[PDB]
Amino acid sequence: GEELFTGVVPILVELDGDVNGHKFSVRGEGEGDATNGKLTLKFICTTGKLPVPWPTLVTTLVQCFSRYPDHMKRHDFFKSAMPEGYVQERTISFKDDGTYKTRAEVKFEGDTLVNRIELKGIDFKEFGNILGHKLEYNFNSHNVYITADKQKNGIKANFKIRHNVEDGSVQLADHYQQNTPIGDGPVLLPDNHYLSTQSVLSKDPNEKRDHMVLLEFVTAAGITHGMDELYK
Ligand code: NA
Numbered sequence: 726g727e728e729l730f731t732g733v734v735p736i737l738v739e740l741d742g743d744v745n746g747h748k749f750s751v752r753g754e755g756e757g758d759a760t761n762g763k764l765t766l767k768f769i770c771t772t773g774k775l776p777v778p779w780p781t782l783v784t785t786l787v788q789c790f791s792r793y794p795d796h797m798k799r800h801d802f803f804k805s806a807m808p809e810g811y812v813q814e815r816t817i818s819f820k821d822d823g824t825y826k827t828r829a830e831v832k833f834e835g836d837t838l839v840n841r842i843e844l845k846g847i848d849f850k851e852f853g854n855i856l857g858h859k860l861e862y863n864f865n866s867h868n869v870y871i872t873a874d875k876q877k878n879g880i881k882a883n884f885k886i887r888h889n890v891e892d893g894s895v896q897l898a899d900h901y902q903q904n905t906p907i908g909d910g911p912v913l914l915p916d917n918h919y920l921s922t923q924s925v926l927s928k929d930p931n932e933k934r935d936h937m938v939l940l941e942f943v944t945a946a947g948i949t950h951g952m953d954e955l956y957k
């Protein structure tokens with residue numbers, strides 16, 4: 726599994742969404758460099774204007790590209806499930822607002838890592854921060870807290886995204902996550918740990934379509950056994 730991620734790997738992302746009955750599609754393309762934990766993608770709304778803010782889709786739009794330190798290689802569920810891949814599900818609860826439910830398959834198709842997603846959003850406030858587009862076009866750094874789920878031969882994760890709001894307030898989005906392998910084979914079931922994630926959103930000044938350019942870094946941490954020799 727891990728050997729598939731040496732070097733730079735092309736990435737395809739496809740999302741079909743329905744938020745409060747507003748249907749939309751997103752296509753993303755780019756590269757991941759798991760040795761450096763680096764992602765670079767560009768996303769387009771293929772159906773017109775995106776009816777929610779781009780930042781609210783970042784977490785949904787490939788944690789197999791995390792850089793796991795050498796002393797933690799045996800806790801990398803995501804790569805261990807490759808190439809057959811895994812199913813990733815979330816509930817994303819926007820504080821004082823609606824909910825996204827997402828289901829994704831993350832897997833290799835040839836040499837390409839593909840993330841194919843269905844997203845359903847309900848109970849959003851028509852004039853709230855999301856459907857009213859009051860979120861700033863930026864992103865904070867976050868930790869993703871991971872635990873094994875032996876019963877499903879996979880993992881769970883929990884975290885809270887903080888979305889800056891135009892009025893200086895913060896919009897919280899609580900994430901609950903479950904991943905399960907697509908194949909029947911063994912996977913690595915990790916000890917508790919987390920992914921440290923950083924993101925930068927930008928625009929392509931030559932792009933006329935509704936879009937998002939994304940740079941992300943992801944690195945795993947939170948297991949310290951055993952790194953003694955690395956200090957000197
Ligand atoms: Na990194």
Ligand code: NA
Nearest residue numbers: 866867868885
């Ligand atoms: Na955090």
